[PDB]
Every structure is written in C-alpha cells, then in structure tokens.
Scaffold this motif. Sequence first.
Motif, PDB file in Angstrom:
ATOM      1  N   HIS A 182     -20.010 -18.767 -23.910  1.00 43.97           N
ATOM      2  CA  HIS A 182     -19.458 -17.615 -24.614  1.00 43.97           C
ATOM      3  C   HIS A 182     -20.464 -16.475 -24.700  1.00 43.97           C
ATOM      4  N   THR A 183     -21.728 -16.787 -24.994  1.00 43.30           N
ATOM      5  CA  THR A 183     -22.729 -15.739 -25.163  1.00 43.30           C
ATOM      6  C   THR A 183     -23.089 -15.098 -23.828  1.00 43.30           C
ATOM      7  N   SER A 184     -23.398 -15.916 -22.822  1.00 39.02           N
ATOM      8  CA  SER A 184     -23.828 -15.390 -21.533  1.00 39.02           C
ATOM      9  C   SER A 184     -22.680 -14.832 -20.704  1.00 39.02           C
ATOM     10  N   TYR A 185     -21.432 -15.154 -21.044  1.00 33.81           N
ATOM     11  CA  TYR A 185     -20.306 -14.682 -20.247  1.00 33.81           C
ATOM     12  C   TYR A 185     -19.236 -14.021 -21.111  1.00 33.81           C
ATOM     13  N   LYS A 186     -18.606 -14.795 -22.001  1.00 33.36           N
ATOM     14  CA  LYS A 186     -17.470 -14.279 -22.763  1.00 33.36           C
ATOM     15  C   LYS A 186     -17.869 -13.122 -23.672  1.00 33.36           C
ATOM     16  N   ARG A 187     -19.120 -13.086 -24.124  1.00 32.71           N
ATOM     17  CA  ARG A 187     -19.603 -11.932 -24.871  1.00 32.71           C
ATOM     18  C   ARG A 187     -20.011 -10.782 -23.960  1.00 32.71           C
ATOM     19  N   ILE A 188     -19.907 -10.961 -22.644  1.00 37.85           N
ATOM     20  CA  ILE A 188     -20.194  -9.903 -21.684  1.00 37.85           C
ATOM     21  C   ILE A 188     -18.924  -9.581 -20.908  1.00 37.85           C
ATOM     22  N   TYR A 189     -18.447 -10.541 -20.113  1.00 33.11           N
ATOM     23  CA  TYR A 189     -17.288 -10.329 -19.256  1.00 33.11           C
ATOM     24  C   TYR A 189     -15.959 -10.587 -19.958  1.00 33.11           C
ATOM     25  N   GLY A 190     -15.962 -11.278 -21.096  1.00 32.37           N
ATOM     26  CA  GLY A 190     -14.753 -11.509 -21.868  1.00 32.37           C
ATOM     27  C   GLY A 190     -13.582 -12.084 -21.096  1.00 32.37           C
ATOM     28  N   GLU A 191     -13.849 -13.069 -20.241  1.00 30.17           N
ATOM     29  CA  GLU A 191     -12.820 -13.693 -19.418  1.00 30.17           C
ATOM     30  C   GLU A 191     -13.077 -15.194 -19.391  1.00 30.17           C
ATOM     31  N   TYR A 192     -12.336 -15.899 -18.546  1.00 28.48           N
ATOM     32  CA  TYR A 192     -12.599 -17.317 -18.342  1.00 28.48           C
ATOM     33  C   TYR A 192     -13.842 -17.484 -17.474  1.00 28.48           C
ATOM     34  N   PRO A 193     -14.760 -18.384 -17.833  1.00 26.14           N
ATOM     35  CA  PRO A 193     -15.996 -18.506 -17.064  1.00 26.14           C
ATOM     36  C   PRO A 193     -15.734 -19.161 -15.718  1.00 26.14           C
ATOM     37  N   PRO A 194     -16.409 -18.712 -14.664  1.00 25.56           N
ATOM     38  CA  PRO A 194     -16.243 -19.355 -13.357  1.00 25.56           C
ATOM     39  C   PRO A 194     -16.881 -20.734 -13.335  1.00 25.56           C
ATOM     40  N   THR A 195     -16.475 -21.525 -12.339  1.00 20.28           N
ATOM     41  CA  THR A 195     -16.946 -22.904 -12.254  1.00 20.28           C
ATOM     42  C   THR A 195     -18.415 -22.969 -11.851  1.00 20.28           C
ATOM     43  N   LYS A 196     -18.820 -22.162 -10.866  1.00 22.53           N
ATOM     44  CA  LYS A 196     -20.193 -22.228 -10.372  1.00 22.53           C
ATOM     45  C   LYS A 196     -21.194 -21.805 -11.441  1.00 22.53           C
ATOM     46  N   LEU A 197     -20.844 -20.808 -12.255  1.00 24.99           N
ATOM     47  CA  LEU A 197     -21.754 -20.354 -13.299  1.00 24.99           C
ATOM     48  C   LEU A 197     -21.785 -21.321 -14.477  1.00 24.99           C
ATOM     49  N   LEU A 198     -20.647 -21.941 -14.794  1.00 27.73           N
ATOM     50  CA  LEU A 198     -20.592 -22.851 -15.934  1.00 27.73           C
ATOM     51  C   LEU A 198     -21.381 -24.127 -15.667  1.00 27.73           C
ATOM     52  N   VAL A 199     -21.307 -24.650 -14.441  1.00 29.00           N
ATOM     53  CA  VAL A 199     -22.038 -25.870 -14.110  1.00 29.00           C
ATOM     54  C   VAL A 199     -23.540 -25.618 -14.142  1.00 29.00           C
ATOM     55  N   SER A 200     -23.970 -24.430 -13.709  1.00 24.95           N
ATOM     56  CA  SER A 200     -25.394 -24.111 -13.724  1.00 24.95           C
ATOM     57  C   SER A 200     -25.943 -24.052 -15.143  1.00 24.95           C
ATOM     58  N   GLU A 201     -25.120 -23.640 -16.109  1.00 23.32           N
ATOM     59  CA  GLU A 201     -25.569 -23.595 -17.495  1.00 23.32           C
ATOM     60  C   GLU A 201     -25.592 -24.978 -18.133  1.00 23.32           C
ATOM     61  N   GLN A 217     -13.953  -8.916 -29.380  1.00 23.78           N
ATOM     62  CA  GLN A 217     -14.492  -9.803 -28.355  1.00 23.78           C
ATOM     63  C   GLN A 217     -15.531 -10.757 -28.936  1.00 23.78           C
ATOM     64  N   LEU A 218     -16.375 -10.267 -29.846  1.00 24.57           N
ATOM     65  CA  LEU A 218     -17.410 -11.117 -30.427  1.00 24.57           C
ATOM     66  C   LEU A 218     -16.819 -12.091 -31.440  1.00 24.57           C
ATOM     67  N   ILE A 219     -15.980 -11.594 -32.351  1.00 20.26           N
ATOM     68  CA  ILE A 219     -15.390 -12.463 -33.363  1.00 20.26           C
ATOM     69  C   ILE A 219     -14.364 -13.398 -32.733  1.00 20.26           C
ATOM     70  N   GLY A 220     -13.563 -12.887 -31.796  1.00 14.90           N
ATOM     71  CA  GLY A 220     -12.577 -13.718 -31.128  1.00 14.90           C
ATOM     72  C   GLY A 220     -13.174 -14.827 -30.287  1.00 14.90           C
ATOM     73  N   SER A 221     -14.445 -14.696 -29.896  1.00 11.13           N
ATOM     74  CA  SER A 221     -15.091 -15.753 -29.127  1.00 11.13           C
ATOM     75  C   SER A 221     -15.336 -16.988 -29.985  1.00 11.13           C
ATOM     76  N   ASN A 222     -15.809 -16.793 -31.219  1.00  8.19           N
ATOM     77  CA  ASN A 222     -16.027 -17.926 -32.111  1.00  8.19           C
ATOM     78  C   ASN A 222     -14.712 -18.486 -32.640  1.00  8.19           C
TER      79      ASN A 222
END
Lengths: 250, 241, 244, 217, 226, 41
Positions: A94-113, E57-62
Amino acid sequence: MTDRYSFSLTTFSPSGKLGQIDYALTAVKQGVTSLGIKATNGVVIATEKKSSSPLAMSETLSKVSLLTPDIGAVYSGMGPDYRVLVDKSRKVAHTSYKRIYGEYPPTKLLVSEVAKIMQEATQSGGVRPFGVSLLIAGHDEFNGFSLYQVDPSGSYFPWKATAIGKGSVAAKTFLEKRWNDELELEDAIHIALLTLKESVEGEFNGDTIELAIIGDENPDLLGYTGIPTDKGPRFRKLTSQEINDRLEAL
Amino acid sequence: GYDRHITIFSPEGRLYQVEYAFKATNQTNINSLAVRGKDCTVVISQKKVPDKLLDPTTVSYIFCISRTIGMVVNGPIPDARNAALRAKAEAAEFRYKYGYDMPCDVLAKRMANLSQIYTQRAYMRPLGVILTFVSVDEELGPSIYKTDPAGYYVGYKATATGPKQQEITTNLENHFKKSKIDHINEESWEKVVEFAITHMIDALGTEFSKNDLEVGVATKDKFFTLSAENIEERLVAIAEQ
Amino acid sequence: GSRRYDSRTTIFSPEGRLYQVEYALESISHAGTAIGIMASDGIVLAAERKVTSTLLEQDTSTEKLYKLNDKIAVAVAGLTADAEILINTARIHAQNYLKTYNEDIPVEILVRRLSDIKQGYTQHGGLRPFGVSFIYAGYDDRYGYQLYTSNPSGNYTGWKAISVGANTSAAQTLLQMDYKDDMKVDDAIELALKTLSKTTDSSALTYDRLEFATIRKGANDGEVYQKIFKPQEIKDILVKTGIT
Amino acid sequence: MSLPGSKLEEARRLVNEKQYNEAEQVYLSLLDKDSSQSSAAAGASVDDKRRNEQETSILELGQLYVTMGAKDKLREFIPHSTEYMMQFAKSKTVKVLKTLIEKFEQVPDSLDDQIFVCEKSIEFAKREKRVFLKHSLSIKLATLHYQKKQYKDSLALINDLLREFKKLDDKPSLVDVHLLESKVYHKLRNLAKSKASLTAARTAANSIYCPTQTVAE
Amino acid sequence: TTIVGVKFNNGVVIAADTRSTQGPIVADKNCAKLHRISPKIWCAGAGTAADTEAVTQLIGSNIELHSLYTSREPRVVSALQMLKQHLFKYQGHIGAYLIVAGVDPTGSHLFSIHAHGSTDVGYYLSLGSGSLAAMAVLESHWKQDLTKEEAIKLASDAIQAGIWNDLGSGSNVDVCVMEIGKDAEYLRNYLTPNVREEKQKSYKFPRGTTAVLKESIVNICDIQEE
Amino acid sequence: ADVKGVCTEAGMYALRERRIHVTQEDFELAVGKVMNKNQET
C-alpha cells in the motif's frame, strides 16, 4: 538497549549455505502438502486444511487470504508467520504502490517486496527467518498468467506446476506426467484434486480442502458496476459445497 | 545444549522454546470449559482454593477486557495480568480509530501477533500463558477463539485445558454428535449455564461446590460474572432432575 | 590455530581471514558459474543457472542476469536473496548521479559505492557479509569497455575475461588457452559456450540453462545494438557454434 | 418450459404413466428439433448450455433400449457420440462412455453388445487423447470375458498388457489388473499364477487406498 | 460544486455533478468527483479537489486494509473516524470537504466532514458552493420514508437547482444508488440538461495553412540501450 | 556394492516364480525395487 553480540548472524554451515535455510526447508518438508498449477486460461491452487482438534471450525482458519483480487496465495509453511507476513506485505504494497499509483499492485513488483520481508528477518540479527513457503499466483495484462514460488530462503522463481509439503517430492513427478502445457484451467482443477488427495487420503471431502482459482473478471464479486471499463475481481474463492460438486463428477 | 537456549532454529528445524512455553501452562492445572450456545456463551473455569489466609473472591482466571468481551487464561497468573493489560489497551484504542465494538476474531489476531513478536525478539520472551477470548459477536453470534502462546489461533466448539482436557473434550465430543449441532437448545441463557456444569462434573468425575469453580457469562450487550450466590443457585436446579 | 573462533566480525583469525568470509565464495562456488568476457567491439556475458528442475520456467526469469541501467549490466553469482537489496541500492545510486549531474553513471562511480556496502557489514555492526560476485560490464568513452569483478570484499580488480562460481580454476584455464588479442564478439560467444560445456556436468548444455546477454557495437549492419536475448534465440546459437 | 431439464424430467414420468415411446420422442426432440444458439460442434443441436442435459438423456435412452429389446440399435449409437465430444466437456468420454457401460451392469445386457462396445469403439473419440487414458476401459474389457467364459483371448491380451502397464501409465491401476488376473487362472485351476498375481496385488495395495471396491475383494 | 444525498428504507442514495471548475474558468466539462472508500461506501469531494484525492487515497488504503484483515466489511463510522482524525491533526490545514455515505450490515448512515475538523450527522446533507441553493429544495417537497424511486427523482432535482443557480454546479449529474442487501448501482450521466451544440460554421484547417520552420523525427519505439 | 543389489533382485523375482531364466519383464521389476531400496534408509 543493545546487549553484546545479540545481533549476531554468524551461524553458517560448513558447506557455505545458510543453516537457517536448511532448517526452514526441513520443517516445511514435513508440513501439510500444498500445490499449485498455472494453466493456459486460468490458475488453480489447492491445499488441505488442518484437522487438529475434532471440534475445531474450518471457517476460522483460512489458508488462502486476499491481498488484492488479482492474485491468489497459499502456504504450506508457518501458520502464525503467514498472518504477520501478510500484514507487512499489505502495508508495503500500500505504501510503496497504492499510496503512489492507487491501483492494484502488479505481480512482479509484489513478489519482489515479499522477498524483502523474508530477507529483513535474515538481515536483522536476533530475528528468526520466516519459515513460510508461499505460492503467489496472479494474472496481469502484461505477463498474463504468472505462478511464482517464494521460498523461505528469500528467493522466488516461476513454476508451471509445483507442490510443497510432505508429498512435494512425489507430487513433482505427478505434475510432470499428468499435467501438460496444453491443459487448460478446467483440466488443471481435476489434477489439483487428484494430486492433493494422494497426500492424505483420510478425508477427501471439501471440508478439509480449500480450493481457490483466479479466473476471468466477475462483475458480481466487486459489488458495484457503475463503470464498464473497470475490471472486476479476478480472484474467486470456491465454497466447500461447490468443491464436493466437482468431486462427485471426478 | 545451546540449541535449546537459542531463539533461532534448532538442528531439527523445530523450536524447543515454543514447546517449553506449554510447560508453564500446566503449573496451575486448571480445567476450563467454554461452549458456544445460541444467543449466549458460557465459560466455566476451575478456581484453586488456597488456605484461609487468602481471599477466594480476588482469585480469578477470568477478566473483563471490554464490553461483552471476556478472557480466561490457563497458565502463569503473573504472566496473565501482563497479557490482560495488553488486550485491554488494544480494545479501547480500537474504538477510537473505528467506533464499533471490537469483535473476538480480530482480538485473537492482535494478541497472537504481539505474542509472536516476542518469539522473534532475542530479548523479550514469549508469553507462557494460554489466551482464550470469548464474547458474543453481532454478526457471528457466540464465538470462542483460543490463541496459542506462539501466535496461533483457531475456533473451538468446546475448549479444554489442563491435564484432564482429554476427559472434557471427549465427553463433549460425543454430546455434539448426537444433536449434530454446535449450539445448545433452551435459548434462555439461565439453563444453558447449568447444562455446562453437569457435563463438566460427569467428565471430571468430581462434583465441585461454589467455591471450587467460577462461571463467566457472556450475553448480548452485557458482560458479567456470577457471584457466590448465583453459582450456588445454579447447583440447586441441577440437583433437582 | 588450535581452536576455531568464529563469533563476531571484529574477531580476527591467525590467518587474518574472517571465518564468515571463508564460506562466502565457497557458497558462490556452490552456485552456478558466471563467466564475463570483455572484447574490443563489446562485452559478452554468459552464466548458467543452479536450478535443475524442468518444471521451473527459465525463459521468462533470469536468476543471475540483471540489468542495472542502459549501459552497465552485471551478473550476480551467489545467494540470490541477499543480493536483492544491493542491486536496488545500486540502481538508486546509479540514478543519484543521473539525477544531480544529468549524465549516465560510469563503472567506477558505481563500484566504489557498492564496495563500501559490503564492508559496512563487516566493519561496523554484528551483521554478516552477503557473499555475492558482481561482474561489471559497463560502457565508457575514456577507457573504452571496462570489466570488473567484485567479491564480497569492497575492492575491485580489472579483468579481460573472468570466471567465478563452480570450476573457477577449471574454466579460467580454458579462457587463457583460447584467449586472442583481437577478441571479436562472435569469437567471444564461442569461447563462452565451449567453456561452460566442459565445466557443467551436463554434456547436452540446453539453451534454457544458460543466460546469454551481449553488449556489443559490432552487431549487424554496422550499428550499436543492445538486446537481452531470450532462450529461443539461444537455442539457435548453440547449433551455429556446434554445441548442439 | 423450453428447458433441457424441464422436458427431460417431464418425460421421465411418462414411461409408467402412458408408454415408453412418448418418453423417447421427447429426448430425441431435445437433440435434432430446434435448439440452435451461438455456434458449436454437436451434430444434433447447437448451444453450449444444452450439452449437459443431452448426455443425461442418452443414459435414459440407452437404458430403455436394452430393456425393451432395442439394444441392437444402441451399439451403433455410442460411436456416434464422438461428434458431441468436440464440444461437450472437451472430449473426456469418461463422463459419458464410462457411464454407458455402467448401465449394462445395472440392467442385464447380452454379452454380444457388451463386448461389441469395447471392440468396435476401442479407440475412444480421438487418436491423441487416449494414449494415456486407454487404461480406463481396458480393465473392463477382460472383465466381460469372465461372463463369456472364454479365458483364451482374455489371457492373451493381459500378457502383452502387463509389459506396458508397469509404471508407464497408472501405478495403482495394477492392483485391479493383478486382481482380475488371479480370476483368470482360478477357473483354470492354476495355483501358481493365481497366488503370484494376488500376492503382488496385495503387496502393492499398501501404497494406495481404493474406496471399498478393491481391498474388500 | 453541489453534493446532495438522501437516505431511504433500504439504503441511501447520493448524487453529485460532473462539472469541476478551478477559479473563474471552468476546468473540465465532465469530471467525476465521486471517490470510493469501500465497494459499498462512496464519498464525493468538494472545495479543493486535490486534497480530496490525496486524503481519500491515503485513508482509503487503510480502510481497504481493514476490510480484508478482519474478514469483515468495515462499518460506515470506520470510514468517518479515521477521516476525522486526519483533518484534526493539521488543525484545519487540509481543505478537503467530503461526504461519508455507505451501507453496512448495521444499517444506513450518512455523514459530512469539514476542513475545520468537525463531523456531522443527519438524514440528508449538502456540501459545496451550491449547498445553500440545494438545501432549500430538501426543506419543502421532502416527505418521511421515501421509496427508492422517490429518492432518485428528489436527488436529481436537488442537483438541478444548483445547475441553473450556482455557477460552479452544472453539466451532468452522477447518481450512486446504494441499497442494503443488494449491489450498489452507480448511474453514470443520469440527468443531462443538454449536449454539445453544433457551431454555425465548421472549422477545418487544411495542411499548409501554418508555416513549419524545422522538422525532426523522434522515435518512441524500443531504442538501443548501448 | 549397490550394483550387486540388482543382481540379487534379478533372482528375487525369479525365485517367486521358481524360474531359472530371467526375461525382459524381470529387468524392469528388478531396477524398480533397487531404486526404492537405495532411497530408503
């Protein structure tokens, strides 16, 4: 507060490999047998639940969780360490992706994390490595269907068909002979039920078997359609009652 | 050897310290019985009777974490109060960040991870107690989650602890097979409490008085503990049958 | 000497070598063999893979073959997990020079930063060094093509053709015997495939078990061309070179 | 109605109510008559949603042909189902062909038609698909020779079958093969070949568990 | 900008326009201001649009983290609680205006939050520059216990009142119907006042009407890394 | 030393049949037993 060498990560084997890796693979080798298969039109994963006390409820313990429903997951490894890893995997995803790109995380990036989480336990002294063996199965629009196996050593590799558990040595040969690249998702589900059954034949019903597949996007699983462009959840968990329907036809 | 004292993996790939956490659970030798009814949850734990220099009322294995929420602990008592304050702190902080009653399934997840963090740390030792959380959920109704000291949690129809747990688990296993239901009839929570006492005496083979046991009660939007007069009143109706 | 003392990184042996380091390359030698070759018209990189399983997908995943940037492309020989942080850190430092100076990073700037990272674990803290063999294939106008090898040390050494991993002394002998001062790219490809065939116990030497990546300006039609070669093209190369 | 399951259950009760001819006409109406949607390969109707209930009606028709004496036409109807396998269940005759022979066990059928369905159709619906799966009905082939009381052609096959069936196809399948092999020499009064085939079957039976239909035997 | 919503027996419905204006100049003709918290909980932003998309986006993530971690869908108060604490921490620095609306197994709930950090509760709530004009409609023709059809027509006229009055409100109307026990129905471009009118003269410039000084070719395809 | 184990298993299946000859069917059964005995214990 730091006490002497307590961060010591000195343990090493005479062969040069990390001793914590061999002891982690040894415990998983005795554990319950899981598996997974990546087919042409879909991906299937299956595992056997835990009996333990006969009064235990199978709905409480879930060996398949959900990160974001583009990807499935199953583990034959540490039970408790899976809950801690998923909690940390989501916060990193969520922090490295969803808080940036705000979408579903890709598979290749999620496995690396996820591989970094197992490394931080080995890198930071005093903390034992994660003894979980994870099978990450997901479907994206770039690589298509992808099935990855994350070992407790911290490394990941793709697999067409693989199995982890007590019968992992025997199931590895079964997946070569029985399953082929030309087989589709429906053909892989029947193999997943036969391969998992050969591990523990005590109870083959759907109460002790947790089956989940990643299929096409289902608009009913999302709960809302206002946008025809937005894709629905690709991950769908099968009900134990639905599992018994395929067992009678198998 | 040194492999037993190290926090990291053993030569067998299995931690001995996790097994040693269950050694202290049998110190008190308390047999707890908790079943999941229809609208209510009945919890009964053995209360050890000390000499006349101690107050049996102050001695309890059941504490109130929050509203409708309760916890029975079988293991070290001094290690239980330290774990009891951790569950109470997470219960109030959960409502400030959300505002709805904290369910039991989530409370079993928080205390399991915090007890699991102690397993990973080289300084803090894991809790050698047993965390059994009981409450009445809004959507899921009565639920009992027994959290292992190493961070594992799973639900049980009827939980049992102590060395005699094999007598309680087996006697209550065949009782659930005849009715083929996990719940108990007589929706009124008054007689449900009395149904657990008879099954506990027949399993243990010894009839206990009001001072030899303590009975927790979990109802809808209320949580309390039966006093000495309420527990004695239960044995009166059980005696007449 | 008498007792073998391995406890902390500060403790020094009478031989002067940390016992934690004794297993650093021996674990790398336990893994596959990565042989870099620096030529006049480019740099050829070839490495095998440790996984012996057929069910694993070797076409879409490169274990020892990684790309740091458009110019520098390295090969990781050692523990795959412990190297994942140093690789991303290398990509962070490579972009830091490109961010501030608006210029592509050379090899020396990247190696000096990654050198202190390995020593940082052995110098301060009770952590462990992560054994990794980095083979640096860069591009530079000043010195031309540069090829370096970084052991879990913190130092670098220039090499025309280097061999690490399994059969280090066996593969290096085949390189020094067939070495040519001219050293074209097509010849460097043949010397790379013929050397890995004798070191690997498998006489067939399948295409999926090899990592073929060539940095060359001598490609077809006399142009500078960079590509990451898929195993589909590797199978056709093994037939032309006479391996298959 | 206009449903494949509605007309199937409606004609099921018409056998005892009026006659069995009215039931067969309804099952045949679900095949050739109408029922055209989208595109598929069947040979009677066209749809992907009708494929499930049409194969069930075949089991009801095949049961009536053996009982009323129409089984002579039923032996030629089974190989005509190959065209249905190009759509329904993506080949996999085990859902259909295996159930067709199962009807011959419940309802008594002559030995001429039971064996003909095994000899004529011996290659099931495809050339490539049955290379691995040929062992499914190959065991029931030698079973029909027991009621035929001819142990010559049955034993001549098993001699060539045991060579290719050892760890080349299905490992537990030998338990059922060596079990029926003892019955061949049992009526031949041969103790050596019967004890050797049963001992190897019971010894290999420790690695698998068959649902009550083998270990009990 | 006008945000209006109304509850009913089986749930709550919320509506907002498609017109997003930055300053005196209209920015976008059709822009969706409705952002998702959870699948069954929707929120529409007002005032500063960037602070809306940043906080949601930040609050909806948690909140999405809270859903799958607890194996249960969060309540409506959960989305409001962590939203109110985020704005109060900065003491009114973030000017994000949001409307909390959604359904939970408990029932139907509607809430509104302000930049100052104070929350609110009520049957119907209005927000935005057109909140003054849209509130007047709900104070007259509204009746107790409206049906599903009567709640949609009332929410459409509430936004329409701000179209012909508020300058920032206009264009189309986005109505999101949320019913307890069923799927959430989001109607895209529900109320359309008009469409793009054809100009009196078609403007087409042939090639050569504009002089070109120099011409270069930029290749966006795969380029050689070396 | 394990090669002679195949020689022992070659006569093991021949002893159960009381046959002094070894046909092609016995070679496939002899190697299958040795591979299991080598991996066991």
